[PDB]
Amino acid sequence: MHDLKWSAAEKKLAHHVFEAALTTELAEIMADFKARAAAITQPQEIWPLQEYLARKQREIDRKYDYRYSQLLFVFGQLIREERVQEAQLAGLSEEKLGYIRRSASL
Amino acid sequence: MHDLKWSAAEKKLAHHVFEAALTTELAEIMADFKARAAAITQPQEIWPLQEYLARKQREIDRKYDYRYSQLLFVFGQLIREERVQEAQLAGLSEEKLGYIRRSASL
């Protein structure tokens, strides 16, 4: 809940970085899911798979919050996870980058 | 909601037939699930897979109702689906078999 003004260039650059990170992570999840599915030998084993999928959807939902008021926190958190690099967001304002860096400290 | 008395031999035979049918159907579902999972190419496609799994769990839950008051209906319904044959339940009472046959008519 950072109420700053975003330029068109800022929303464009943010969209590119958000998408790149989300795409990479979802690819990872899809590969893991498929692996787990293939490894199933007994019907009851579908249960733990559903537990995984639920946890992953919730995780993604919370982490990839595409609301501008939240994007500085999101980016910081992705930088902390090493899914985004600060260089990718250099076009954003210095104010924004400061907030992102602080968010990468939580 | 058929309130009849069941002998030990009757519950034993019923258990054998119930298990045989459930085992076959769950094997089918597991194979289909695995096929669908393997065929997924995009993350969003996990959604329709979850819709399938939910429908299948509900279906099984309702159909394989292991309560003695309901087993004559269950068996009749499985006979109608061709997952059980009446010969498998010949050891049950004639009264029970009559109820099963009527249930196979719905």
Author numbering:
A (entry chain A), B (entry chain A): 1 to 106
Per the authors:
To understand the ancestral state of FRPL proteins before they were transferred into cyanobacteria, we heterologously expressed, purified and characterized the FRPL from one of the few isolated, mesophilic bacteria that feature FRPL (PbFRPL): the gamma-proteobacterium Pseudomonas borbori, a close relative of P. aeruginosa. Circular dichroism spectroscopy of PbFRPL showed the typical all alpha-helical fold, previously found in FRP in solution, and native mass spectrometry confirmed the distinctive dimeric state. We solved PbFRPL’s crystal structure to a resolution of 1.8 Å. The N-terminal domain consists of two antiparallel alpha-helices of about 50 Å in length and features a homo-dimerization interface similar to those in FRPs with an estimated buried surface of around 675 Å2. In P. borbori, the frpl gene is encoded on its single chromosome, and we did not find any OCP, HCP or CTDH homologues. Epi-fluorescence microscopy of PbFRPL fused to an mVenus fluorophore and expressed from a plasmid under its native promotor in P. borbori showed a homogeneous distribution across the whole cell during exponential growth and an additional concentration at the cell poles upon starvation with increased whole-cell integrated fluorescence by about 2.5- to 3.4-fold above wild-type increase. Our data indicate that despite their extremely similar structures, FRPLs carry out a potentially stress-related function that must be totally unrelated to OCPs and the regulation of photoprotection. FRPL from P. borbori, Methylocaldum sp. and Chlorobi sp. had virtually no effect on OCP1’s photo-recovery. In our AlphaFold2 model, phenylalanine 76, lysine 102 and leucine 106 in FRP of Synechocystis sp. PCC 6803 are in contact with OCP1. P. borbori FRPL for instance has the phenylalanine, but features a tyrosine at position 102 and a serine at position 106.
